[PDB]
Scaffold this active site. Structure first.
Site, PDB file in Angstrom:
ATOM      1  N   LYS A 270      58.749  46.788  32.567  1.00 41.50           N
ATOM      2  CA  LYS A 270      58.360  46.428  31.203  1.00 41.50           C
ATOM      3  C   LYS A 270      57.428  45.239  31.242  1.00 41.50           C
ATOM      4  CE  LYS A 270      59.730  48.031  27.332  1.00 41.50           C
ATOM      5  NZ  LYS A 270      59.376  49.441  27.107  1.00 41.50           N
TER       6      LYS A 270
ATOM      7  N   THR B 134      62.844  51.459  30.942  1.00 39.62           N
ATOM      8  CA  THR B 134      62.109  50.188  30.767  1.00 39.62           C
ATOM      9  C   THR B 134      62.684  49.485  29.531  1.00 39.62           C
ATOM     10  OG1 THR B 134      60.302  51.179  29.449  1.00 39.62           O
ATOM     11  CG2 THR B 134      59.947  51.060  31.803  1.00 39.62           C
ATOM     12  N   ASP B 135      63.175  50.269  28.579  1.00 40.87           N
ATOM     13  CA  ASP B 135      63.797  49.700  27.383  1.00 40.87           C
ATOM     14  C   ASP B 135      65.046  48.826  27.705  1.00 40.87           C
ATOM     15  OD1 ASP B 135      64.080  49.887  24.248  1.00 40.87           O
ATOM     16  OD2 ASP B 135      66.071  50.216  24.957  1.00 40.87           O
TER      17      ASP B 135
ATOM     18  N   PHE C 289      23.898  18.998  43.152  1.00 41.35           N
ATOM     19  CA  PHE C 289      23.877  20.212  43.988  1.00 41.35           C
ATOM     20  C   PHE C 289      22.496  20.258  44.664  1.00 41.35           C
ATOM     21  CE2 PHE C 289      23.590  25.084  44.359  1.00 41.35           C
ATOM     22  CZ  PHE C 289      24.455  25.136  45.512  1.00 41.35           C
TER      23      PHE C 289
ATOM     24  N   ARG D  26      23.907  16.686  37.025  1.00 34.79           N
ATOM     25  CA  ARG D  26      24.013  17.871  36.186  1.00 34.79           C
ATOM     26  C   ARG D  26      25.390  17.853  35.573  1.00 34.79           C
ATOM     27  NH1 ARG D  26      25.773  22.923  40.268  1.00 34.79           N
ATOM     28  NH2 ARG D  26      27.691  21.999  41.036  1.00 34.79           N
TER      29      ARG D  26
ATOM     30  N   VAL E 294      31.225  21.794  44.559  1.00 31.30           N
ATOM     31  CA  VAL E 294      32.447  22.115  43.858  1.00 31.30           C
ATOM     32  C   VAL E 294      33.486  22.487  44.945  1.00 31.30           C
ATOM     33  CG1 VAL E 294      33.603  23.845  42.506  1.00 31.30           C
ATOM     34  CG2 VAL E 294      31.416  22.873  41.690  1.00 31.30           C
ATOM     35  N   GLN E 295      32.998  23.096  46.033  1.00 31.25           N
ATOM     36  CA  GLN E 295      33.863  23.511  47.147  1.00 31.25           C
ATOM     37  C   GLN E 295      34.637  22.338  47.738  1.00 31.25           C
ATOM     38  OE1 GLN E 295      30.953  24.618  46.663  1.00 31.25           O
ATOM     39  NE2 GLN E 295      30.675  26.773  47.256  1.00 31.25           N
TER      40      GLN E 295
ATOM     41  N   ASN F  97      32.747  28.678  37.280  1.00 35.23           N
ATOM     42  CA  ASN F  97      31.740  27.760  36.699  1.00 35.23           C
ATOM     43  C   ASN F  97      31.242  28.194  35.306  1.00 35.23           C
ATOM     44  OD1 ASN F  97      29.503  25.737  38.470  1.00 35.23           O
ATOM     45  ND2 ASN F  97      31.494  26.429  39.314  1.00 35.23           N
TER      46      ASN F  97
ATOM     47  N   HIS G 275      27.899  27.534  33.174  1.00 37.58           N
ATOM     48  CA  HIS G 275      26.614  26.859  33.249  1.00 37.58           C
ATOM     49  C   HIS G 275      26.029  26.395  31.934  1.00 37.58           C
ATOM     50  CE1 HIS G 275      26.847  28.331  37.355  1.00 37.58           C
ATOM     51  NE2 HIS G 275      27.193  29.481  36.805  1.00 37.58           N
TER      52      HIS G 275
END
Lengths: 295, 299, 295, 295
Positions: free
Chosen positions: D10, D57-58, D159, D176, D227-228, D254, D256
């Protein structure tokens, strides 16, 4: 600490391409959303902030457009294999490219009973997708799928004989509404390279069409008490019709419709055999999966 | 301070109804989402916290279900009229009922070339809607619509000759992609009450089908320099094919597809005549609207 | 046939503006989504395919960026008045401008108890909006609002004494959960022109803050059996605290939480006074609105 | 053909729970969306249409409701563990339960500078989640995460130094905007059973508070050209601060913000150092991931 896994690239790159037939003047449009993730010897970008090993994500986007300009974008299995192959061959320090493509429907309009040469309609939100993994020295792996296909049958579905214990309140039933979204995936046998993929090109569109037709036909015709068994039957037929397929996978997120008891109101009868008006439920939902292969 | 306006009710009521043909065995299903809003002498609920004038939202929900069970749910114009009338005719302090209905597509499956008796597919996110206002003493106002209809033509659209000044960078063009989501509403002449709506039942599906067909065929065939012009042509034709229609309103959200210059890459040509690969833009988007009515000129 | 009404322009223009303080080195960012629709003598673009009267929707977009560049973007009430006025003044055949502005939240982060000079977080999906109608010869009409504010109180809400007939099944209660999204709009008295808007600039941010505070406090503190009366109390306080406001409009889309009876399972008690676990309902939902004015 | 994998259960079960302090009268609310998928000897429901192996599933739904009533629902790592264990202890043929929980925020309102006892606001759309895998004779695997955490820094992001070839048009930059949605997951060491999970309870919330604070602070303070490299510094801190964690995974899509060149308009300068007005891009977006483990 140690970088155990790393991937990076451009997601949600929307692409449109038009094909103009030079003889007939008929135009055919293709629209897709592309994602490319690269792996390779790029650990130093994380450990030392060395960007020298990074192919900018912007350049990845540019490459997607250029590749679509110089090659066929259909079938998507080929396009993805071309795009993935490009990155591993162009960059020595890149060892895997993972391409994901979502194809959007643009169906030719029929105007006055004839197909129009350049007008289209977005009929469904149903998608045709491919996932292509191109790994240096391990060939090309392709998973093809259809998704967002939404169906409903108003009768010839049952559910009875399930386990019952102190957690169970559901009543067994011999006539109900069966509705679900359908996600179906078929994994191709591993391909040795681009040349092999290109030679199997005609099989891609044909197998997508088969998977779609078998799914619809079995769903509509099977009078069943088990959604699980209906899905296994769909999968068996697809595997029988295409030997190059290794496995089929289904994921069906059920959509429930509840009876609405109206007896409290002038003894109005709307349950069981008298059920006419139902309450579609937004959530929760049954989710049923299986991956079927060859014995 | 005083209460200038008040409305309340139940929104997002999902309803399904199936019709079964004993004779043939053919089943037909209907699905929709319903909103009902009520107005009347109910200021006290705001001012004095008086719930005695309040028909509970929960009860408005049950009423939708009870009315669906006892009446045809199609055409939706009929159903919303039956439903809004119920409220002002059953509650004395209730003076107006606002009924909004969205019809979802459950299209019959063709299996092996034949129509299946009980399996359906959701073949589009396109909706058929109605807004019905039932006001005590002023009869029944109906707006019918189609929405979520998404189209694209890959050529035979132009846009040149527009105003150019210092805020302008757009280049003129004689061949471009035109794509849009269509929203079309047609307003019916006021009906006196339910019996009048009942007498016109057949015109409802007929005019929905005409509005759709006129929209598609005009969009596909028109070689127009303005979307404004193409939209006006659609409205004219609908007004001309159905006399009970007073106005037609179109709202077109343009979806832009920009050319991509690739000449910085070895001189690759991908603009003008050589344009094959475009970038679809998610935003922003042009938005064009108009309401078209009948002219008072007798010739 | 004849054109009864016509409007067109540019929707969904995303705009970001940064303010840099050279002394403190503190930065402030503003992000919004703008829509500008124009009206005027443009009939012939519909009737005669005459584009000469058309200011291109692309040039409307350019004008939005150019305008944000040369003017303050806050408060949005001012910015929108500037943008609307520019079109009716620049073009002779344009006589109404409709500006819609949605402001997104970029709340300054606090790092180590201190407000960072240049890092921000989206602390909520709640919006601050304005709708500005600039009509030639008739001044400037401004509607301000907050939306997307979602609240919940676990007790101290009641609901009894409502009309009961043969369509009623709801049981009265004296304790229940009250949850709702809040849409609140305040309509400013008409402004004769930009100069008048410019002189009341300080009133805008303050009234919004007042509107927000009044909403949360009354919602939190009211123990009512009427959501209608609660929102009427909200409107009064806003109207009282700000004389330049003509009307206050509330739209409250209720969110239901159903009790779950579990007594079939070992005498588990989970209703009334013992209710602890509830099922949130996705739909349907009660919708309550009102517009409150001055006597 | 053969069933290679199968799972069902469920999804989208919405659950709300209130905790009332009789002493203080202070209420506390928890709301979440739960998914339970089961695995076991259920192949025959697919191959033979045998439902006797099927826990409805109920009933899985009912069970999540009863479980939440009988137990503490926080921390979610604990609740998930109890709920997954239940299936493998109650049913002979079920050997694995996969539980996914998404916790929604309901933050206590501050009215007049004092916490309100029973009124809440949905501040952000940010989630705290868990994925628990309870597999017979293999213990309990827990992955915790936070997601939907959106942040922006208006400067102090650079960057440059990336690979540049015939596909590259991006210009290098030393200042940036950097904006992203953050998805961070931490994987705990395998737990032997419920009792061991219960023994570490305090660590769950504390480790979530730590991962959140390290993510915000590192993002705010790091002035990186990668960013890495920033995400790697985040994972390091988390691994250093919680020994019971085996791996940390970050996924950053990201968002932009493009510079708008306006010089074509009366020489307006809005690029490089004069850049004030930007265009937020909805797509496409860079997407950067890594999984950081211990040496």
């Amino acid at each position: 600490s140690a970088v155990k896994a790393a991937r990076y690239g451009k997601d949600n790159v929307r692409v449109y391409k038009v094909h103009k037939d030079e003889k007939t003047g008929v135009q055919t449009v293709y629209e897709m959303t592309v994602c490319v993730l690269l792996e390779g010897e790029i650990e130093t970008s994380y450990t030392k902030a060395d960007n020298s090993v990074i192919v900018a994500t912007d350049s990845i986007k540019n490459t997607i457009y250029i590749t679509a300009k110089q090659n066929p974008v259909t079938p998507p299995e080929l396009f993805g294999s071309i795009l993935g192959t490009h990155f591993i061959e162009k960059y020595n320090h890149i060892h895997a490219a993972h391409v994901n493509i979502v194809c959007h429907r643009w169906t030719r309009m029929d105007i006055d009973g004839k197909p129009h040469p350049h007008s289209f309609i977005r009929d469904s939100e149903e998608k045709r997708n491919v996932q292509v993994d191109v790994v240096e020295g391990k060939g090309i792996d392709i998973k093809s799928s259809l998704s967002g296909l939404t169906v409903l049958k108003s009768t010839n579905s049952q559910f009875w004989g399930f386990l019952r214990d102190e957690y169970t309140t559901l009543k067994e039933t011999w006539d109900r509404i069966l509705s679900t979204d359908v996600d179906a995936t078929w994994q191709w046998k591993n391909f040795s390279g681009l040349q092999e993929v290109r030679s199997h090109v005609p099989k891609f569109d044909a197998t997508w069409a088969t998977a779609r037709e078998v799914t619809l036909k079995t769903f509509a015709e099977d009078n069943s008490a088990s959604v699980q068994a209906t899905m296994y039957k769909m999968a068996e037929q697809i595997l029988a019709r295409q030997q190059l397929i290794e496995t089929v996978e289904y994921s069906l997120p059920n959509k429930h419709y509840f009876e609405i008891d109206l007896s409290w109101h002038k003894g109005l009868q709307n349950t069981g055999k008298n059920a006419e008006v139902f309450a579609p439920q937004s959530d929760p939902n049954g989710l049923i999966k299986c991956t079927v292969g060859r014995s």
